[PDB]
Amino acid sequence: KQPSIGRYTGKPNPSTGKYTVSFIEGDGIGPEISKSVKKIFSAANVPIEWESCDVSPIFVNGLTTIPDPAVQSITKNLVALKGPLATPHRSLNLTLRKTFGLFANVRPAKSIEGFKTTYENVDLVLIRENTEGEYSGIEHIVCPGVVQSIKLITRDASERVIRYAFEYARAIGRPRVIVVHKSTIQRLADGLFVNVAKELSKEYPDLTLETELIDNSVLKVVTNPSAYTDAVSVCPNLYGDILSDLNSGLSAGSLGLTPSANIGHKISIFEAVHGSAPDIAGQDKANPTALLLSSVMMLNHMGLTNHADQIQNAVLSTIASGPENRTGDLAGTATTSSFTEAVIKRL
Amino acid sequence: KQPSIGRYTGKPNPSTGKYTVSFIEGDGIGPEISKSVKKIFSAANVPIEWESCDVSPIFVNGLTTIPDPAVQSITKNLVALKGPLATPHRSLNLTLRKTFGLFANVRPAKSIEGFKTTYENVDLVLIRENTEGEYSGIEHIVCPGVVQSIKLITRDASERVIRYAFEYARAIGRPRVIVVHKSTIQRLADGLFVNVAKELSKEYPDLTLETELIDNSVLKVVTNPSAYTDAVSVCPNLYGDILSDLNSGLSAGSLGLTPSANIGHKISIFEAVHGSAPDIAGQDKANPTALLLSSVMMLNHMGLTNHADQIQNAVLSTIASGPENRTGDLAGTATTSSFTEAVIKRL
Amino acid sequence: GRFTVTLIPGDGVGKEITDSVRTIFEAENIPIDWETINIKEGVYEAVESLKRNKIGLKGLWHTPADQTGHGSLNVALRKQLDIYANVALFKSLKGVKTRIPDIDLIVIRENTEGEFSGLEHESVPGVVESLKVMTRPKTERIARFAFDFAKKYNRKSVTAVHKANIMKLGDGLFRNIITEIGQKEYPDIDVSSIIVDNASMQAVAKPHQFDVLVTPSMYGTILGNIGAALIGGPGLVAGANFGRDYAVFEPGSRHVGLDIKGQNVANPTAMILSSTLMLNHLGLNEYATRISKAVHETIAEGKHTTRDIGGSSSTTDFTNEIINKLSTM
Amino acid sequence: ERTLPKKYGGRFTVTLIPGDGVGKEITDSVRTIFEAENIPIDWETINIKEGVYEAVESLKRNKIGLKGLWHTPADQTGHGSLNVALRKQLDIYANVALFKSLKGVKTRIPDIDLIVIRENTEGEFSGLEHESVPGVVESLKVMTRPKTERIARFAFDFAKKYNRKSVTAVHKANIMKLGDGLFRNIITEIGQKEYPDIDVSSIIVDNASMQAVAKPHQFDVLVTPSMYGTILGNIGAALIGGPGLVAGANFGRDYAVFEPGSRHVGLDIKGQNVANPTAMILSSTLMLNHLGLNEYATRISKAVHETIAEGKHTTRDIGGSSSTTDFTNEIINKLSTM
Numbered sequence A, B: 001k002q003p004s005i006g007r008y009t010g011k012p013n014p015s016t017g018k019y020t021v022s023f024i025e026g027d028g029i030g031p032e033i034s035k036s037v038k039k040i041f042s043a044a045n046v047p048i049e050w051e052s053c054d055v056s057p058i059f060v061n062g063l064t065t066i067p068d069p070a071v072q073s074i075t076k077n078l079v080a081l082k083g084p085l086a087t088p089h090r091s092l093n094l095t096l097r098k099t100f101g102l103f104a105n106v107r108p109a110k111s112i113e114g115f116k117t118t119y120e121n122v123d124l125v126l127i128r129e130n131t132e133g134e135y136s137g138i139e140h141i142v143c144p145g146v147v148q149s150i151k152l153i154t155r156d157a158s159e160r161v162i163r164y165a166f167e168y169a170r171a172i173g174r175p176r177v178i179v180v181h182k183s184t185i186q187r188l189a190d191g192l193f194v195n196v197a198k199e200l201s202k203e204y205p206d207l208t209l210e211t212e213l214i215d216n217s218v219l220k221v222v223t224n225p226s227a228y229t230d231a232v233s234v235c236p237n238l239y240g241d242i243l244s245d246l247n248s249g250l251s252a253g254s255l256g257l258t259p260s261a262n263i264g265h266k267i268s269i270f271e272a273v274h275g276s277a278p279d280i281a282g283q284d285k286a287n288p289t290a291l292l293l294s295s296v297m298m299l300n301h302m303g304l305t306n307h308a309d310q311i312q313n314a315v316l317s318t319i320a321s322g323p324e325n326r327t328g329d330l331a332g333t334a335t336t337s338s339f340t341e342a343v344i345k346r347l
Numbered sequence C: 001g002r003f004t005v006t007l008i009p010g011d012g013v014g015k016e017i018t019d020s021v022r023t024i025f026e027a028e029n030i031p032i033d034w035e036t037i038n039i040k041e042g043v044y045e046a047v048e049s050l051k052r053n054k055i056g057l058k059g060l061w062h063t064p065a066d067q068t069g070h071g072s073l074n075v076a077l078r079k080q081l082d083i084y085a086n087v088a089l090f091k092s093l094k095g096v097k098t099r100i101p102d103i104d105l106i107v108i109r110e111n112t113e114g115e116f117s118g119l120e121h122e123s124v125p126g127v128v129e130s131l132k133v134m135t136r137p138k139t140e141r142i143a144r145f146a147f148d149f150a151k152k153y154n155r156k157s158v159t160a161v162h163k164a165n166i167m168k169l170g171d172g173l174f175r176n177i178i179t180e181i182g183q184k185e186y187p188d189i190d191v192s193s194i195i196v197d198n199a200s201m202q203a204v205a206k207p208h209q210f211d212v213l214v215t216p217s218m219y220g221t222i223l224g225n226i227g228a229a230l231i232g233g234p235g236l237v238a239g240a241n242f243g244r245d246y247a248v249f250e251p252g253s254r255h256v257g258l259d260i261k262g263q264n265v266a267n268p269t270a271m272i273l274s275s276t277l278m279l280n281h282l283g284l285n286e287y288a289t290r291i292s293k294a295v296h297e298t299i300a301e302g303k304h305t306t307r308d309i310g311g312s313s314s315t316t317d318f319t320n321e322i323i324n325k326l327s328t329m
Numbered sequence D: 001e002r003t004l005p006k007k008y009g010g011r012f013t014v015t016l017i018p019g020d021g022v023g024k025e026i027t028d029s030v031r032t033i034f035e036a037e038n039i040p041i042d043w044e045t046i047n048i049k050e051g052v053y054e055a056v057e058s059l060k061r062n063k064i065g066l067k068g069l070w071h072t073p074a075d076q077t078g079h080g081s082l083n084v085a086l087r088k089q090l091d092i093y094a095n096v097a098l099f100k101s102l103k104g105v106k107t108r109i110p111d112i113d114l115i116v117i118r119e120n121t122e123g124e125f126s127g128l129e130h131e132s133v134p135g136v137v138e139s140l141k142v143m144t145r146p147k148t149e150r151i152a153r154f155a156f157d158f159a160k161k162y163n164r165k166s167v168t169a170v171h172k173a174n175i176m177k178l179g180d181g182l183f184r185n186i187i188t189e190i191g192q193k194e195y196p197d198i199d200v201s202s203i204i205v206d207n208a209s210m211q212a213v214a215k216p217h218q219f220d221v222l223v224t225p226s227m228y229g230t231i232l233g234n235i236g237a238a239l240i241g242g243p244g245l246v247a248g249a250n251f252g253r254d255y256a257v258f259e260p261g262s263r264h265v266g267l268d269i270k271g272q273n274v275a276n277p278t279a280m281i282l283s284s285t286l287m288l289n290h291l292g293l294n295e296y297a298t299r300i301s302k303a304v305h306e307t308i309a310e311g312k313h314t315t316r317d318i319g320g321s322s323s324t325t326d327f328t329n330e331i332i333n334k335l336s337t338m
């Protein structure tokens, strides 16, 4: 059972056996990294047809809006899979969450088989509040040389993230769920977050709730990543933004391998978190793995367990073993091209 | 029909024909001013028995609380009539509103027959938000020589005051209802208040909604008080606190004649707004008129129209004509004693 | 020998009421030349002008109440020039029927801070916070200005209006700093406090007890309008704004008169009188002493006075009586 | 000169605040090494709910202190840091933590040497918060030019004094454009027109966190507001072995308080004599260098440095089996033969 909170409303397009999913190839290495996914998906017989759309921003009322073509598409099919895009007057990614009601960032960082980094056995899962907190637009110049940035924390916004965390922890069979905070000096703000978890704790008795200060969350994770391999950590916007980029640093030393999932109430977008890599674009050197894993995340969110496990457990995860495969970013010699067919083989 | 918003839940005590009302004689001239009311009420055959209680504060958890005796009493009988009390660690009047959910101050200022002041034909009615606004406890020292006092304005708190105003304006047959504000420079704060009135405006089509800046509300009222004799003005906490004390200044030059009503959702307290006048206490010189009129405002709130109009239209209002009556504060020569019997005569 | 002053007619009766002054000025051949400006964000050009000339004479601009409205830009002008002190002069006039007569009080307000700090936000929908800033520096400043002013114009009493019993930090700081530096400097002057609501009541009922009132932005708008009414109306009130470097003179009552624009019904007493304040400032004041007596006598002398005082004359006619009385002094 | 450190005929009087958790044991370790080296300092030692007053008052007399960490509640009616209270009330505005790896310690990335300077009194540690309506909470984060210019110069001054070539400002200025913006500017701004010899740069806190864990050698000195310093701090703490190896110090204009650079109480192992005093001792040496001794400091640091490099006899958390007691005595032993 997938998490009740951001539940996909299936419905395959009655005319075809398939489900509809918006793409958003994105720019840069996006196109190549993209059709790489389309092919691998084809081969495995995924009940999915691609409705690619363009999120290049309009500017209705000076405030950057996202095109109707893409809005209608994405609101319709309750799911989308975007690759990386450039930096085109109101964060593109921000107006993307605001127009689709996305409120939770899910960020896993797991060690990759056959790619040696300094940290080992790192298998981490973190849910981050992506609505409020330190990252509300609210800041003021109270006088000449004095500024206030205002951190906003509400029970409503907290409740629904903390829920998805309990429910996601359950959906992937992890016993523990840790609320990262700093009630120490942010008594009210972080205190509310923590209490809301403590109160929700009771209607999820199969999971055990722990509370940790970022202090320790960062100390302990870096000394020993595996202590959280039964994790799922929930935390407010800032701690989340840092811990997730940190976790990735532990798992892979960069974030060219990291997948993210942006869960909204009825919609949800799944993206790779690396950049547009404009300088490697077209030359067929990109590494689909990142986006590819977001595809898996998406599959599971949709309910297509069998396909997800198929494309992940076998394929990519396994084909990233043997340096004739792999890509330039992992010592490997293979091209985006050869990685994709080399993948589909064990597909 | 009395205003839906703070509706009294009647129920006369089945054993007696009467309704139960908590008193709170208060201190200072309170006792004398009080039984003055008890007598006048007796004479007119009011369906009311007095359950006097003491609000002398406890201090549960350093935070000043109000005694159980008085709480039970007042929560029970859904109404109380307090006289003036002294200055005993958390405003006594404040913890009085917070523990009984009082949220709206109703303040009328009308010229008195046979007492000449500088302003004439002043008949004013003002409803004031007594929950939030400038008067929330929220203030901060942002650094060495810099302070923030925070004005809080919410739709929930605004809605229910603005409602009682439309509904009270209706209940006393005034066509116009004016929202005093300063959207000019407090765009969001006062803007929200104003919009909430403008939106409520529609579900009260018998009344006409106007909007005025305190700028004009104070300018116009002082140049010509009568321009608002079809008034009922609603406004946020601060503008309210000032305009009401101002209105009284116009009507009587002090506030020894001013009655207030503090409306809560299910409870409601009716008090005189003058002080404890400790130096005139016992000597029988006080002036019940103030509290007495609050009695009237209570009667109406309870539904006892006939009695209220009786005790107001005749009595006091009329007995305050002839200097042999009246009290020392109005040139008169009469005592609290003689004022009360002199009243009951035309009662 | 020729000053170049800034002229900002502004909205409403602004344009007419300024003209009245121009006419009385050239008819008295006063050695000043107007640099005159008109305007949505060219409130820039007003600032830039005043920064050159240092001195200005202006009416009021209009301010929207809607959400996508632009914002005062009367305050913008002051904040951007740090013209932090407003003085309004409420002195009753001989030929004017008022409910309480022989009244003479001054209201000094801080212009750049307080509830005019214009910091506000909406946390969640339907919940709005407006932040009111109060700072020691800006407050010590106005405090001294007020006392300095009271000393210069032989005023005996200075009273701080506040709500310090509720906003213990904000208005508290204000009340302290004032009384505090009226005791260790300016000991010759009587310092006191008064709570804004109670102040409002005394002002309307027994105004003679007040001399000078110092207030934060808001309370000054309120006591201001009480004073405006007390003496006849917004058309009789001289006003001036001061900073360290600049000075802008405007009506002390602060009303636009949008409704009677172009009708030539308006009363220029306000504008002219604060115009005389400006003369005294840039040292002329032979003229000021002069043309004030002109308008003072004109309005005391029954009819020929303008509509709102109880006359039937137009702005045009009232102006010409002044220039007439003036031509025989 | 009522403003130098308490001193009477050659003897400094330093403040000692053991504090909660392994505090009491870890301080003792220093005492012992101190009298065994016959260092001319006398401890004025204090213990404590709001007598955080007496700590302040003491430090105001002596000017210098050596302390562990106090414990801080997470519950709603808890008292509040009072580690920060101490600093705010003395305007000890600058925290320095020293993350330099040690010879005898197994770490995942070796040969690492970076410093994290954080502002102590401001930022998210300003402790201004309120609940407007029920369920809605705002925490206000203050950033002011004066407090920021101050730390900025302290950082550069520090980097110059200890021949550090690079200074990097950690921020989130892309989102909190005013708050962290001001911080990033003021730093880079006054690293360009003063301190031109030093390399100034910025880095976004999240990305900084990632580089720190994956490729830490690229960093030299990091300047941060209160929060980011706690975070990068703990990354650095882990990188070198743990919280027990990190020297720390706090500086104000008039006072100086020396504490562990990692900031952990060790509540769980209180009284067990398992704790590691390297942290305390090393920051204790920092204090000696400060009040001018430092023959001693140079000395007793080499002692602990060699002790832990020399395999067994080291304390539990480094990979040894010795107790706090035993580790201390190896230092005093090595010391007795120098």
Ligand SMILES: Nc1ncnc2c1ncn2[C@@H]1O[C@H](COP(=O)(O)O)[C@@H](O)[C@H]1O
Pocket (backbone or CB within 6 Å): B215, B216, C013, C017, C233, C234, C235, C255, C256, C257, C258, C259, C266, C267, C268, C308
């Ligand atoms: N020159 C003037 N003389 C007399 N009254 C004026 C003058 N200008 C404006 N007013 C008054 O102020 C009001 C206009 O200000 P407001 O309603 O705030 O725009 C009108 O009701 C007029 O009665």
Ligand SMILES: Nc1ncnc2c1ncn2[C@@H]1O[C@H](COP(=O)(O)O)[C@@H](O)[C@H]1O
Pocket (backbone or CB within 6 Å): A216, D022, D026, D242, D243, D244, D245, D263, D264, D265, D266, D267, D268, D275, D276, D277, D279, D317
């Ligand atoms: N003084 C210390 N030296 C080294 N490690 C410590 C020290 N205090 C605590 N720790 C470690 O940090 C963890 C607890 O840290 P804390 O956040 O202070 O409770 C424990 O598992 C200890 O292993």
